[PDB]
Every structure is written in C-alpha cells, then in structure tokens.
Tab-separated table of C-alpha atoms in Angstrom:
chain	number	residue	atom	x	y	z
N	1	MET	CA	-0.053	0.074	0.097
N	2	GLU	CA	3.401	2.185	0.890
N	3	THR	CA	3.885	1.136	-2.835
N	4	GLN	CA	0.683	2.504	-4.494
N	5	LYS	CA	0.618	5.886	-2.979
N	6	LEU	CA	4.170	6.312	-4.009
N	7	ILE	CA	2.348	5.510	-8.119
N	8	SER	CA	-0.151	7.749	-7.443
N	9	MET	CA	2.248	10.951	-6.044
N	10	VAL	CA	4.313	9.504	-9.076
N	11	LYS	CA	1.671	10.191	-11.878
N	12	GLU	CA	0.661	13.207	-10.450
N	13	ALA	CA	4.159	15.347	-10.223
N	14	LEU	CA	4.021	13.841	-14.284
N	15	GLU	CA	0.514	15.307	-15.076
N	16	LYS	CA	1.210	18.632	-13.286
N	17	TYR	CA	3.919	19.570	-16.211
N	18	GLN	CA	3.482	18.861	-19.528
N	19	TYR	CA	6.923	17.871	-20.480
N	20	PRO	CA	9.549	14.929	-19.541
N	21	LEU	CA	11.308	14.641	-16.142
N	22	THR	CA	14.009	13.004	-14.165
N	23	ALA	CA	13.628	10.665	-11.067
N	24	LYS	CA	14.748	13.270	-9.141
N	25	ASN	CA	12.950	15.889	-10.917
N	26	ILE	CA	10.244	13.653	-10.144
N	27	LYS	CA	11.042	13.587	-6.184
N	28	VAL	CA	11.529	16.588	-5.692
N	29	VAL	CA	7.837	17.985	-7.383
N	30	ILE	CA	6.698	14.756	-4.419
N	31	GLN	CA	8.643	16.790	-2.096
N	32	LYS	CA	7.562	20.371	-2.731
N	33	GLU	CA	3.538	18.905	-2.872
N	34	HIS	CA	3.331	16.419	-0.064
N	35	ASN	CA	6.438	17.467	2.337
N	36	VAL	CA	7.745	13.838	2.456
N	37	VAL	CA	11.711	13.262	1.632
N	38	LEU	CA	12.423	10.399	-0.689
N	39	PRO	CA	15.076	8.812	-1.838
N	40	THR	CA	15.529	9.324	-5.853
N	41	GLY	CA	15.857	5.580	-5.813
N	42	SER	CA	12.669	4.918	-4.744
N	43	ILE	CA	11.214	6.949	-7.163
N	44	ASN	CA	13.096	5.248	-9.837
N	45	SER	CA	12.335	1.736	-8.138
N	46	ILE	CA	8.347	3.095	-9.144
N	47	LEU	CA	9.041	4.154	-12.798
N	48	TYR	CA	11.326	1.150	-14.173
N	49	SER	CA	8.738	-1.563	-11.910
N	50	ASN	CA	5.840	-0.217	-13.822
N	51	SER	CA	6.474	-0.582	-17.252
N	52	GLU	CA	2.574	-0.156	-18.497
N	53	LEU	CA	2.256	2.749	-16.480
N	54	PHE	CA	5.535	4.951	-17.164
N	55	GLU	CA	7.968	4.912	-19.625
N	56	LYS	CA	11.514	6.701	-20.704
N	57	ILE	CA	10.897	9.374	-23.665
N	58	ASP	CA	14.250	8.400	-24.710
N	59	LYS	CA	14.047	4.762	-26.464
N	60	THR	CA	17.771	5.115	-28.038
N	61	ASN	CA	19.828	4.897	-24.993
N	62	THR	CA	21.233	8.471	-24.746
N	63	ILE	CA	19.614	10.737	-22.243
N	64	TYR	CA	20.460	9.931	-19.240
N	65	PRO	CA	18.982	9.925	-16.208
N	66	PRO	CA	16.413	9.013	-18.228
N	67	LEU	CA	13.566	11.466	-18.613
N	68	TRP	CA	10.136	10.076	-18.289
N	69	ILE	CA	6.592	10.307	-19.220
N	70	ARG	CA	3.492	8.923	-18.448
N	71	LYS	CA	2.514	6.053	-20.862
N	72	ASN	CA	-0.535	7.378	-22.246
Y	1	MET	CA	38.547	23.453	-25.089
Y	2	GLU	CA	37.232	26.719	-26.759
Y	3	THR	CA	34.233	28.579	-25.478
Y	4	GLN	CA	32.834	29.209	-28.591
Y	5	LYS	CA	32.662	25.262	-29.640
Y	6	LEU	CA	31.056	24.302	-26.150
Y	7	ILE	CA	28.360	26.790	-26.607
Y	8	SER	CA	27.359	25.114	-29.869
Y	9	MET	CA	27.801	21.327	-28.646
Y	10	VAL	CA	25.230	22.305	-25.919
Y	11	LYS	CA	23.268	23.882	-28.383
Y	12	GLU	CA	23.623	21.116	-30.614
Y	13	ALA	CA	22.166	18.609	-28.004
Y	14	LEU	CA	19.372	20.853	-27.033
Y	15	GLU	CA	18.797	20.703	-30.817
Y	16	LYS	CA	18.814	16.781	-31.334
Y	17	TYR	CA	15.697	16.978	-28.767
Y	18	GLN	CA	12.154	18.074	-28.859
Y	19	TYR	CA	11.979	18.646	-25.515
Y	20	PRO	CA	13.654	19.629	-22.224
Y	21	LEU	CA	16.973	18.250	-21.016
Y	22	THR	CA	18.879	19.080	-17.617
Y	23	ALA	CA	22.406	20.061	-17.522
Y	24	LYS	CA	23.911	16.187	-17.013
Y	25	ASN	CA	21.252	15.341	-19.812
Y	26	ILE	CA	23.397	17.380	-22.175
Y	27	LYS	CA	26.556	16.229	-20.480
Y	28	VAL	CA	25.715	12.785	-21.329
Y	29	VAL	CA	24.660	13.655	-25.431
Y	30	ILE	CA	28.151	15.469	-25.750
Y	31	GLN	CA	30.152	12.530	-24.320
Y	32	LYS	CA	28.074	10.940	-26.968
Y	33	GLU	CA	29.084	12.225	-30.040
Y	34	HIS	CA	32.089	13.791	-29.566
Y	35	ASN	CA	33.844	11.484	-26.726
Y	36	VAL	CA	34.352	13.909	-24.166
Y	37	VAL	CA	33.798	13.728	-20.674
Y	38	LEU	CA	33.026	16.957	-19.335
Y	39	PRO	CA	31.812	17.929	-15.298
Y	40	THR	CA	28.180	19.008	-15.337
Y	41	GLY	CA	29.050	22.114	-13.557
Y	42	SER	CA	31.295	23.178	-17.422
Y	43	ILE	CA	27.654	22.414	-18.856
Y	44	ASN	CA	25.968	24.674	-16.542
Y	45	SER	CA	28.479	27.726	-16.605
Y	46	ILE	CA	27.135	27.730	-20.672
Y	47	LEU	CA	23.160	27.896	-19.590
Y	48	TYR	CA	23.364	30.636	-17.543
Y	49	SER	CA	26.285	32.965	-19.149
Y	50	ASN	CA	24.138	32.763	-22.153
Y	51	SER	CA	20.496	33.733	-21.899
Y	52	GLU	CA	19.845	34.308	-25.222
Y	53	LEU	CA	20.551	30.859	-26.099
Y	54	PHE	CA	19.197	28.998	-23.244
Y	55	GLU	CA	16.436	29.209	-21.063
Y	56	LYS	CA	14.310	26.915	-18.158
Y	57	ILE	CA	11.230	26.194	-18.914
Y	58	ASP	CA	10.179	26.160	-15.368
Y	59	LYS	CA	9.784	29.694	-14.148
Y	60	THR	CA	8.245	28.311	-10.155
Y	61	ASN	CA	11.401	27.365	-8.871
Y	62	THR	CA	9.943	23.575	-8.716
Y	63	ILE	CA	11.980	21.253	-11.194
Y	64	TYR	CA	15.388	21.038	-10.079
Y	65	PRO	CA	18.112	20.024	-11.523
Y	66	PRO	CA	16.556	22.161	-14.380
Y	67	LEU	CA	15.373	21.347	-17.520
Y	68	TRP	CA	16.654	23.221	-20.446
Y	69	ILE	CA	15.010	24.197	-23.557
Y	70	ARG	CA	16.523	26.221	-26.417
Y	71	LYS	CA	14.877	29.221	-26.693
Y	72	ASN	CA	12.285	29.969	-29.552
D	1	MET	CA	27.375	-1.548	-27.705
D	2	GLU	CA	25.551	-4.169	-27.948
D	3	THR	CA	22.721	-4.924	-25.835
D	4	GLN	CA	23.899	-8.399	-25.263
D	5	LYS	CA	27.468	-7.505	-24.400
D	6	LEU	CA	26.585	-5.269	-21.741
D	7	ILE	CA	23.725	-8.305	-20.389
D	8	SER	CA	26.874	-10.161	-20.144
D	9	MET	CA	29.554	-7.148	-18.487
D	10	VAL	CA	26.892	-6.604	-15.951
D	11	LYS	CA	26.645	-10.383	-15.371
D	12	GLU	CA	30.179	-10.783	-15.183
D	13	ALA	CA	30.588	-7.963	-12.494
D	14	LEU	CA	28.361	-9.578	-10.420
D	15	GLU	CA	29.746	-12.956	-10.461
D	16	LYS	CA	32.987	-11.373	-9.453
D	17	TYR	CA	32.040	-10.365	-6.141
D	18	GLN	CA	30.155	-12.349	-3.199
D	19	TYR	CA	27.825	-10.084	-2.197
D	20	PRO	CA	25.077	-7.251	-3.260
D	21	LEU	CA	26.232	-4.536	-5.438
D	22	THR	CA	24.591	-1.464	-6.866
D	23	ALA	CA	24.102	-0.248	-10.164
D	24	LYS	CA	27.143	2.646	-9.615
D	25	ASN	CA	28.837	-0.173	-8.440
D	26	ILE	CA	28.613	-2.070	-11.519
D	27	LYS	CA	29.396	0.551	-13.834
D	28	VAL	CA	32.324	1.264	-12.347
D	29	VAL	CA	33.358	-2.610	-11.988
D	30	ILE	CA	33.059	-2.541	-15.664
D	31	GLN	CA	35.053	1.067	-16.295
D	32	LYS	CA	37.950	-0.953	-14.739
D	33	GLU	CA	38.207	-4.296	-16.894
D	34	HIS	CA	36.876	-3.240	-19.870
D	35	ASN	CA	37.736	0.777	-20.473
D	36	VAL	CA	34.637	2.160	-21.382
D	37	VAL	CA	32.504	5.059	-18.984
D	38	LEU	CA	28.872	4.232	-19.109
D	39	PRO	CA	26.025	5.815	-17.743
D	40	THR	CA	24.452	4.370	-14.227
D	41	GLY	CA	21.525	4.829	-16.248
D	42	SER	CA	22.336	2.543	-18.989
D	43	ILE	CA	23.293	-0.452	-16.482
D	44	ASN	CA	19.542	0.670	-14.449
D	45	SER	CA	17.768	-0.746	-17.958
D	46	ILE	CA	19.656	-3.811	-18.004
D	47	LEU	CA	19.272	-4.439	-14.408
D	48	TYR	CA	15.314	-3.928	-14.820
D	49	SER	CA	14.502	-5.204	-18.019
D	50	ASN	CA	16.256	-8.415	-17.608
D	51	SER	CA	14.131	-9.603	-13.990
D	52	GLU	CA	15.530	-13.209	-14.479
D	53	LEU	CA	18.994	-13.104	-14.634
D	54	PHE	CA	18.871	-9.961	-11.706
D	55	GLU	CA	16.828	-9.160	-9.070
D	56	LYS	CA	16.623	-6.636	-5.674
D	57	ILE	CA	18.359	-8.572	-2.347
D	58	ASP	CA	16.073	-6.014	-0.357
D	59	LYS	CA	12.305	-6.281	-0.468
D	60	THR	CA	11.408	-4.142	1.602
D	61	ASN	CA	11.714	-0.605	0.437
D	62	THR	CA	14.333	0.398	2.778
D	63	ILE	CA	17.743	0.094	0.706
D	64	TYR	CA	18.211	2.724	-1.751
D	65	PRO	CA	20.309	2.934	-3.986
D	66	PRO	CA	19.176	-0.697	-4.211
D	67	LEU	CA	21.640	-4.040	-3.919
D	68	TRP	CA	21.384	-6.156	-6.713
D	69	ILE	CA	22.542	-10.179	-7.058
D	70	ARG	CA	22.345	-12.464	-9.889
D	71	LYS	CA	20.037	-14.661	-9.245
D	72	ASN	CA	20.597	-17.554	-7.590
Z	1	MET	CA	9.946	36.808	-1.833
Z	2	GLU	CA	11.196	33.243	-1.908
Z	3	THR	CA	14.084	33.601	-3.894
Z	4	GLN	CA	14.543	36.743	-1.639
Z	5	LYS	CA	14.822	34.470	1.702
Z	6	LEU	CA	16.839	31.941	-0.314
Z	7	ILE	CA	19.145	34.687	-1.114
Z	8	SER	CA	19.471	36.305	2.571
Z	9	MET	CA	20.369	32.404	3.371
Z	10	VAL	CA	22.952	31.695	1.348
Z	11	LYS	CA	24.540	34.976	1.937
Z	12	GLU	CA	24.456	33.712	5.794
Z	13	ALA	CA	26.155	30.456	4.943
Z	14	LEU	CA	28.922	32.210	2.859
Z	15	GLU	CA	29.510	34.865	5.630
Z	16	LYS	CA	29.603	32.125	8.455
Z	17	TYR	CA	32.156	30.282	6.639
Z	18	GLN	CA	35.616	32.639	5.918
Z	19	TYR	CA	36.683	30.241	2.228
Z	20	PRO	CA	34.975	29.153	-0.442
Z	21	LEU	CA	31.590	26.495	-0.311
Z	22	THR	CA	30.328	24.274	-3.067
Z	23	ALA	CA	26.246	24.825	-4.023
Z	24	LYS	CA	26.073	21.399	-1.353
Z	25	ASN	CA	28.450	22.872	1.147
Z	26	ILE	CA	26.071	26.138	1.115
Z	27	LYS	CA	23.053	23.625	0.937
Z	28	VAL	CA	23.473	21.549	4.181
Z	29	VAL	CA	24.983	24.515	6.040
Z	30	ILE	CA	21.279	25.987	5.570
Z	31	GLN	CA	20.037	23.014	6.449
Z	32	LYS	CA	21.468	22.806	9.471
Z	33	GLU	CA	20.832	26.021	10.881
Z	34	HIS	CA	17.106	26.401	9.578
Z	35	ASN	CA	16.656	22.801	9.040
Z	36	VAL	CA	15.016	22.871	5.588
Z	37	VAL	CA	15.971	20.040	2.821
Z	38	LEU	CA	16.487	21.873	-0.020
Z	39	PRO	CA	17.393	21.050	-3.715
Z	40	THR	CA	21.006	21.983	-4.322
Z	41	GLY	CA	19.698	22.872	-7.747
Z	42	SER	CA	17.692	25.546	-5.992
Z	43	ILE	CA	21.087	26.804	-4.281
Z	44	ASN	CA	22.607	26.712	-7.692
Z	45	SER	CA	20.019	28.690	-9.405
Z	46	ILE	CA	20.746	31.520	-6.751
Z	47	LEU	CA	24.108	31.267	-7.009
Z	48	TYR	CA	24.379	31.830	-10.629
Z	49	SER	CA	21.296	34.163	-11.363
Z	50	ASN	CA	22.638	36.606	-9.212
Z	51	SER	CA	26.269	37.465	-10.457
Z	52	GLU	CA	26.672	40.986	-8.825
Z	53	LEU	CA	26.054	38.923	-4.962
Z	54	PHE	CA	28.284	35.380	-6.165
Z	55	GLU	CA	31.064	34.530	-7.907
Z	56	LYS	CA	33.151	31.375	-8.661
Z	57	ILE	CA	36.366	31.596	-6.980
Z	58	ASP	CA	37.980	29.357	-9.822
Z	59	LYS	CA	37.871	31.255	-13.134
Z	60	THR	CA	39.659	28.511	-15.293
Z	61	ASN	CA	37.082	26.205	-15.437
Z	62	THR	CA	38.051	23.500	-13.620
Z	63	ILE	CA	37.430	23.358	-10.069
Z	64	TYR	CA	33.928	21.064	-10.524
Z	65	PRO	CA	31.419	21.174	-8.570
Z	66	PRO	CA	32.421	25.205	-8.729
Z	67	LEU	CA	33.842	26.844	-4.932
Z	68	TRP	CA	32.004	30.295	-4.517
Z	69	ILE	CA	32.693	33.415	-2.872
Z	70	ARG	CA	30.344	36.200	-1.796
Z	71	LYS	CA	31.271	39.164	-4.165
Z	72	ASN	CA	32.448	41.514	-1.670
P	1	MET	CA	28.284	13.174	21.623
P	2	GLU	CA	26.431	13.682	18.753
P	3	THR	CA	29.418	12.015	16.414
P	4	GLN	CA	28.453	8.790	19.109
P	5	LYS	CA	24.621	9.552	18.368
P	6	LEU	CA	25.488	8.960	14.900
P	7	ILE	CA	28.273	6.009	15.468
P	8	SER	CA	25.590	4.009	16.869
P	9	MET	CA	23.116	4.606	14.219
P	10	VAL	CA	25.767	3.426	11.601
P	11	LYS	CA	26.587	0.556	13.644
P	12	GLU	CA	22.866	0.070	14.222
P	13	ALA	CA	21.894	-0.028	10.503
P	14	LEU	CA	24.779	-2.217	9.148
P	15	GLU	CA	23.786	-4.929	11.797
P	16	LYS	CA	19.893	-4.846	10.765
P	17	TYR	CA	20.747	-5.843	7.129
P	18	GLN	CA	23.459	-8.674	6.709
P	19	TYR	CA	25.360	-7.720	3.588
P	20	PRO	CA	27.697	-4.575	3.045
P	21	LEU	CA	25.919	-1.755	2.652
P	22	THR	CA	27.145	2.345	1.149
P	23	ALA	CA	27.264	5.339	2.829
P	24	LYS	CA	24.302	6.497	1.278
P	25	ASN	CA	22.412	3.239	2.084
P	26	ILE	CA	23.150	3.650	5.407
P	27	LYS	CA	22.289	7.318	5.346
P	28	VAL	CA	18.727	5.901	3.912
P	29	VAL	CA	18.312	3.272	6.366
P	30	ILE	CA	18.705	5.744	9.048
P	31	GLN	CA	15.996	8.141	7.532
P	32	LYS	CA	13.744	5.547	7.598
P	33	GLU	CA	14.633	4.192	10.732
P	34	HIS	CA	15.065	7.571	13.173
P	35	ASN	CA	13.647	10.224	9.996
P	36	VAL	CA	16.874	12.823	10.189
P	37	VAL	CA	17.596	13.570	6.958
P	38	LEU	CA	22.086	13.438	7.310
P	39	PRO	CA	24.309	14.730	4.778
P	40	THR	CA	26.391	11.542	3.361
P	41	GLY	CA	29.143	12.601	4.217
P	42	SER	CA	28.865	12.501	7.165
P	43	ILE	CA	28.015	9.057	7.186
P	44	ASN	CA	31.099	8.708	5.046
P	45	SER	CA	33.159	10.540	8.050
P	46	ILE	CA	31.893	8.007	10.513
P	47	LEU	CA	32.961	5.530	8.657
P	48	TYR	CA	36.872	6.446	7.548
P	49	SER	CA	37.656	7.801	10.791
P	50	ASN	CA	36.438	4.688	13.162
P	51	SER	CA	38.662	2.226	11.513
P	52	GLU	CA	38.413	-0.099	14.364
P	53	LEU	CA	34.110	-0.194	14.043
P	54	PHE	CA	34.027	-0.014	9.691
P	55	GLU	CA	35.903	-1.583	7.545
P	56	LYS	CA	35.511	-1.538	3.342
P	57	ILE	CA	34.434	-5.019	2.057
P	58	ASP	CA	36.706	-4.829	-0.810
P	59	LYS	CA	40.391	-4.003	-0.185
P	60	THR	CA	41.133	-4.298	-4.098
P	61	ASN	CA	40.355	-0.280	-4.724
P	62	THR	CA	38.144	-1.561	-7.488
P	63	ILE	CA	34.085	-1.188	-5.563
P	64	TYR	CA	32.719	2.655	-5.661
P	65	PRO	CA	31.116	3.867	-3.772
P	66	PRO	CA	32.824	1.996	-0.902
P	67	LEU	CA	30.646	-0.841	0.528
P	68	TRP	CA	30.997	-1.046	3.938
P	69	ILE	CA	30.813	-3.952	6.545
P	70	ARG	CA	31.384	-3.838	10.525
P	71	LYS	CA	34.531	-4.918	11.944
P	72	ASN	CA	33.577	-8.094	13.550
W	1	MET	CA	47.785	2.359	-10.845
W	2	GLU	CA	50.420	3.206	-7.854
W	3	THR	CA	49.371	4.382	-4.613
W	4	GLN	CA	52.463	6.510	-3.912
W	5	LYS	CA	51.556	8.709	-7.206
W	6	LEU	CA	47.896	8.904	-6.188
W	7	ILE	CA	48.976	10.585	-2.833
W	8	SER	CA	50.999	12.948	-4.845
W	9	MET	CA	48.685	13.910	-7.358
W	10	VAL	CA	46.100	14.607	-4.797
W	11	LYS	CA	48.723	16.455	-2.856
W	12	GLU	CA	49.933	18.497	-5.437
W	13	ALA	CA	45.632	19.167	-6.800
W	14	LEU	CA	45.451	20.912	-3.320
W	15	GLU	CA	48.677	23.043	-3.509
W	16	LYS	CA	47.731	24.402	-6.663
W	17	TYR	CA	45.286	25.916	-5.511
W	18	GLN	CA	45.066	28.672	-2.271
W	19	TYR	CA	41.658	27.106	-0.669
W	20	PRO	CA	39.874	24.322	0.826
W	21	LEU	CA	38.754	21.976	-2.306
W	22	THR	CA	36.234	18.728	-1.323
W	23	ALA	CA	37.435	15.388	-2.695
W	24	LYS	CA	35.691	15.730	-6.016
W	25	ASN	CA	37.598	18.639	-6.402
W	26	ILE	CA	40.462	16.892	-6.690
W	27	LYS	CA	39.255	13.781	-8.815
W	28	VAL	CA	38.395	16.948	-11.531
W	29	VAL	CA	41.519	18.577	-11.612
W	30	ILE	CA	43.255	15.420	-11.508
W	31	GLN	CA	41.166	14.204	-14.607
W	32	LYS	CA	42.305	17.280	-16.122
W	33	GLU	CA	45.974	17.141	-15.792
W	34	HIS	CA	46.731	13.466	-15.958
W	35	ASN	CA	43.628	12.899	-18.057
W	36	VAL	CA	42.485	10.092	-16.104
W	37	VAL	CA	39.031	9.354	-14.640
W	38	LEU	CA	38.861	7.822	-11.324
W	39	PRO	CA	36.382	7.439	-9.008
W	40	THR	CA	35.487	9.852	-6.190
W	41	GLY	CA	35.736	7.491	-3.466
W	42	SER	CA	39.519	6.448	-4.745
W	43	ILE	CA	40.904	10.038	-3.482
W	44	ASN	CA	38.718	10.048	-0.329
W	45	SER	CA	40.840	6.544	0.560
W	46	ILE	CA	43.803	8.602	0.180
W	47	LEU	CA	42.947	11.630	2.004
W	48	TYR	CA	41.955	9.982	4.714
W	49	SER	CA	44.844	7.397	4.461
W	50	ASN	CA	47.322	9.784	4.987
W	51	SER	CA	46.286	12.233	8.099
W	52	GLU	CA	49.411	13.331	8.040
W	53	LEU	CA	49.484	14.774	4.954
W	54	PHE	CA	45.773	16.161	4.349
W	55	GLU	CA	43.588	17.753	7.214
W	56	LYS	CA	39.195	18.857	6.401
W	57	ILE	CA	39.032	22.319	7.154
W	58	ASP	CA	36.112	22.487	9.211
W	59	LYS	CA	35.769	20.329	12.691
W	60	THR	CA	32.141	20.738	13.878
W	61	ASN	CA	30.913	18.563	11.349
W	62	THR	CA	29.067	21.128	9.226
W	63	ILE	CA	30.846	21.248	6.129
W	64	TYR	CA	29.348	17.713	3.736
W	65	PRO	CA	30.730	17.255	1.249
W	66	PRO	CA	34.180	17.742	3.795
W	67	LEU	CA	36.436	21.374	2.166
W	68	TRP	CA	39.920	19.051	2.529
W	69	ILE	CA	43.523	21.481	2.680
W	70	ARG	CA	47.138	21.012	2.666
W	71	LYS	CA	47.991	20.227	6.819
W	72	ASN	CA	49.814	23.144	7.018
C-alpha cells in the first residue's frame, strides 16, 4: 500500500507538468507538494517496475539520467 | 577547449531533442557524439552565461535539477 | 554498443563479487575491466529489463540505491 | 519573496565560513541552521542568477563542482 | 556526543542488514528508522574515521562507492 | 595505478589552489592534468588514510562534502 501511494504521487507529478521529468525532478516535485523526502532510488524503482504506467521518452539509450513520461 | 565550441555542442544537444533537457543530460549527450567527458558544472556555466540562447522551462522554482530549452 | 554484450558485462561484474552491488558499483566495475565509461542509468535499464538474470536483494523498499544480486 | 529569503540564507552561509563553499556545502549549512531540505539545484539557481552577489573563486573552468564566494 | 549518536546509528543500520551497505544505503536506512536527513558525507566521515569499527568489504580499490561492513 | 603516485597527484591538486577543495574537486583536477577518470571514492581513501598530509578544514561536522586542505 505504501507503493500504491507512491505510484499515485509519481503519476501526479508527471501529470502536473506537461514535459518529461527525471526521477530526481519527480522526487523534488513530490517533496514540494507532499513534503516528504524520498530516496531518488524509490522513485526509480516505481518508474522501472511499472512499465505499463511509465516509460522513458528516449528509447535510443542516450538521455541519462532518463527522462520519463506517463504511458498514455 | 574553446568557449565557442562548447556553446555549439550544448546548443546542438538541445536541438537534437524535442523536449527540455537537464544540464547533466546535455553532458551525456555531448560525451556520446564528441567522446569527451566534461564536468556537469561546465555545461551550467554555458547555460546561465548565455541567457539569449538558453532558458529554463520551469519558472516556478520547482523543477530541480532545472530542465532547459533552446529559447524559441 | 550491443545489448547482449552489456548484459554479460553486468552479469560478469556481479559474478566477480560475493555480495550484492549497486548499479553504480557495476558501472565502476565495468569501467575498470573494459575501460568504457557508461552512464549509471544504462546499467539500470539492463538490471530491470532482465528480471530473470538479476534481482534486488532487499524487498522491503528500504535499501536505496538498490543492491542487486545475480539471481541464484 | 521566496527567492529573496533563499538569497539571504545563501549570503548567510557564505559569510559564516571564511572560505569558498560548493552549492551542496551551502545547502547543508542552510539545512543545519534553518532545518529545511532544499534541492541543491535551487542553491545553484541563486548562485548563477545573481552574478553581482556571488561569483566562482575559480575563473579557469577547472574546479567542479564550483566553489563559490560572495562578491565583496 | 553527536558523533557517538551517529556511530550507534551506523552500527545499527549495518547490524540490521546482513550484507555490505554503501554510505548512502546507511543514510537512508537511518532516515527510515530515525527520520532525520543526514548528509551522506557525515556517514562517510563516521565510516572512514572509525577504522576499528568499520571497514570496506572490498580491499582491492575497485568497488565505488565503497561497500561497508562492521569490523567483527 | 600506484598508491604513491595517487598521494602525490592529490597532494599536487591541493597545492595548486589557495583554498580548501572537496574530494570530488581533487578528482576533477586530476582528470584535468593527468587525463585519468578516477572514482570519487578513490580520492577519499587517500585523504583519510594519510592524516599526516591532509586534514579537513571544518571541525564542527557541518561542511559536507568535507573541504580538505594540505596540512600546514
């Protein structure tokens, strides 16, 4: 259930801004809006592990740290 | 190596992509097509010191590290 | 350079050590014995996209950045 | 007005220590004194954008992450 | 006395997990358990400065960021 | 490559500058004049393991990442 709360926060960051975001961008967006300091890795875990909810905008293995969008 | 070749490598990097990039993204892009590893802070010097060619896309002091665009 | 040579470099790196490694550890290991500097995020792509060869050792969402093992 | 508050905190960190500081040094100095966790990027933004208040002690494009002093 | 409190927290993180941890792993373990955001450097200081309490599991100067165990 | 050549590269790096440097600063300095990219953690090993040549300038456990000086 913690993971589901974070997934909703990640979607929420991504939907608030209409361009791709790095995992660290998403972390700080969640920090400013929900005032919790989360490890950047925990945002990455969500991003990589829910491949039907999030995807990298760069599919050529060049943009690092990767930029992420919602898969929709 | 030359101020005026780094301006144009950063500028090329932004122009290759349709979305904002971080300074570190640009670093990795340049390391890819010109095979030179620059410090992340060398790109920031260029980006801030040339406010006519580059601007940040978020102006609410929220997105960090900042996402940069080639200014239209 | 090749997806299937990076899988085996990451996989070699884990196998050289008796304990879990981070993605960045693996990066530095590969930079050591194959003299190529990869972005940290390129290793993560491999680790998550090959969940049959690699798994995280902590499953409590606590260890970040995650520690990875060659799956037994 | 948020930016003005941060500018005052940055000056305050720099004036408390009588040697140059990195943006991350300044971040943690502000954390310990004012107990707010700010993105390192937001300190950088202040530093780079107020070129008449702050300047890099290294003008040879070598020290990275840059070391900063107050321009005075 | 602050340093002694941190030393006890570092030992406590290391003893809670039965594999080596990076300084940033230890930081976030202490964050989750004691809810304080400490600079990663302050964990490193403890680790490097108390060489009879902590040691790197890798003695070949390869694993970076280093992985740490309790010396026992 | 040699313990005793890294001691003298770190030591040269500090001596080139009139102010304290971080371990990462030293890394970038060495990458500049000897064209070898070392992991940040390799410099820390040298700095802490040679407490006769190097010391931190802040002794209040505030400046992180620590700023280092050639000991007078």
